[PDB]
């Protein structure tokens, strides 16, 4: 209950950091570990960076400043961006990353359960978004408790953008960062940060069919 927005080791074990080493390695996007080899993030993180050779993924990481050359990392094997996604648009901003080597689940690395197909209409009350967002990049992984807002109520503010049923609204948050909510005593990945007015998140529930098909 102490620490405020600062997170603790193993509190969000599914949180991963996506980084690229071009000249000076830096954190670009967050992601959700959904399996041994699978990471779920936002498609727009790869706009202009399609090559898989430069991406480094860190799991079980809390303090980004502690990352060193010796720190283990996962290399991308396949970047499955949603076919309907377009760089010029924010719709369908969901991407799947396949890691070259399966990760071992530990006290600091665990997958996040995905919502069931029927969970597209359920309402969540205890939701959190975690990331190393900006203010520079915060060293310690941050956590923020944000309430969810209905699509009808959200559209009143983002009048310039069409909020589809495949999106969630709420309102220290990374692009592609997880939006998790505790339901029935189990934490589920409800959304993916897409627009950082309220935050807008890709509704993972609507994309389960795509996720499972690509994953399997």
């Amino acid at each position: 209950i102490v620490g405020g927005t600062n997170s603790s080791w193993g509190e969000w074990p599914w949180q991963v950091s996506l980084q690229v080493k071009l000249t000076a390695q830096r954190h670009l996007c967050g992601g959700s570990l959904i399996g041994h080899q699978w990471v779920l993030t936002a498609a727009h993180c790869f706009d202009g960076l399609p090559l898989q050779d430069v991406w480094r993924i860190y799991s079980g990481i809390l303090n980004l400043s502690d990352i060193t050359k010796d720190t283990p990392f996962s290399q991308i094997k396949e970047i499955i961006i949603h076919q309907n996604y377009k760089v010029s648009e924010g719709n369908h901003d969901i991407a799947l990353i396949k890691l070259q080597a399966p990760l071992n689940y530990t006290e600091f690395q665990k997958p996040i359960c995905l919502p069931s197909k029927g969970d597209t209409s359920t309402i969540y009350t205890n939701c959190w978004v975690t990331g190393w967002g900006f203010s520079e990049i915060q060293n310690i992984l941050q956590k923020v408790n944000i309430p969810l807002v209905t699509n009808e109520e959200c559209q009143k503010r983002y009048q310039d953008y069409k909020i589809t049923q495949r999106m969630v609204c709420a309102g220290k948050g990374d692009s592609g960062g997880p939006l998790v909510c505790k339901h029935n005593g189990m934490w589920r990945l409800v959304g993916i940060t897409s627009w950082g007015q309220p935050g807008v998140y890709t509704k993972v529930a609507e994309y389960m069919d795509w996720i499972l098909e690509k994953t399997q």
């Epitope: 209950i1 193993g10 006290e107 029935n184």
Partner: antibody, heavy 121, light 108 residues
Framework: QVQLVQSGAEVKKPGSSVKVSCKAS????????MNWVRQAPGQGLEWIGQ????????NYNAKFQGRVTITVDKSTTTAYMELSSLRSEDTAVYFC??????????????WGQGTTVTVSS | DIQMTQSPSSLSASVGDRVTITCKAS??????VAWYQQKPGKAPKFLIY???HRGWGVPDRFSGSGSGTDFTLTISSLQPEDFATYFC?????????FGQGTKLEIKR
């Protein structure tokens, strides 16, 4: 700031029940597990149970199951522990402790000042 | 229930000394062990979690180590404020359990 303030000391007789309250402030009361721990004068620390106020989910130590009921009042952000069928051995200082993590009940990063409960005829 | 045995029950040391408290779990608790500091009449204070990581604002002199069934708390340079009872807790499995406590006393 983050505070956990418990009720005052209680003196009870055997066979009665005591209700210890823990008023929390300064954080997301509904998102953290509230744990109840008692420290008997000669048996160290003993975890009683925990409640997640958001869903009212509870876990009780099998020792106390059937006698402890942990409940919360979201409106006032207050957690309660109700220990029934009190015995003289229940004399102890009862603490409420907030979990370090939103996602799990242990460990406890902050404790209340404790409530002395004395059970005696 | 997983029993947690701390050693020694009491320990005398001086300001500036390096002191080590050990906690032994009767079962494998991995690294799911936390350490608490309690002074007389006050509430326990959170020091270590996951057996090595310090809590919020805990001085760097407090060091935790160990895994499996054997765990250790080390204070590199005892300050007069460090003299108190120390408890180890395991949260690998429920019910959560604490050690009997190790009291640090001023050597005279």
């Amino acid at each position: 700031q983050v505070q956990l303030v418990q009720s005052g000391a209680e003196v009870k007789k055997p066979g009665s029940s005591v209700k210890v309250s823990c008023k929390a402030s300064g954080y997301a009361f509904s998102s953290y597990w509230m744990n109840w721990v008692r420290q008997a004068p000669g048996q160290g620390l003993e975890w009683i149970g925990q409640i997640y106020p958001g869903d009212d989910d509870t876990n009780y130590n099998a020792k106390f199951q059937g006698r402890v009921t942990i409940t919360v009042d979201k409106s006032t952000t207050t957690a309660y522990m109700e220990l029934s069928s009190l015995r003289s051995e229940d004399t102890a200082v009862y603490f409420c402790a907030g979990s370090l993590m939103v996602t799990t009940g242990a460990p406890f990063d902050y404790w209340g000042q404790g409530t002395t409960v004395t059970v005696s005829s | 229930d997983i029993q947690m045995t701390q050693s020694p029950s009491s320990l005398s040391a001086s300001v500036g000394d390096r002191v080590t408290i050990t906690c032994k779990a009767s079962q494998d608790v991995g690294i799911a062990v936390a350490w608490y500091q309690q002074k007389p009449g006050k509430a326990p204070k959170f020091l270590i979690y996951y057996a090595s990581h310090r809590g919020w604002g805990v001085p760097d002199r407090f060091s935790g180590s160990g895994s499996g069934t054997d765990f250790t708390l080390t204070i590199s340079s005892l300050q007069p404020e460090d003299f108190a009872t120390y408890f180890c807790q395991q949260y690998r499995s429920y019910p959560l359990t604490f050690g009997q406590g190790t009291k640090l006393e001023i050597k005279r």
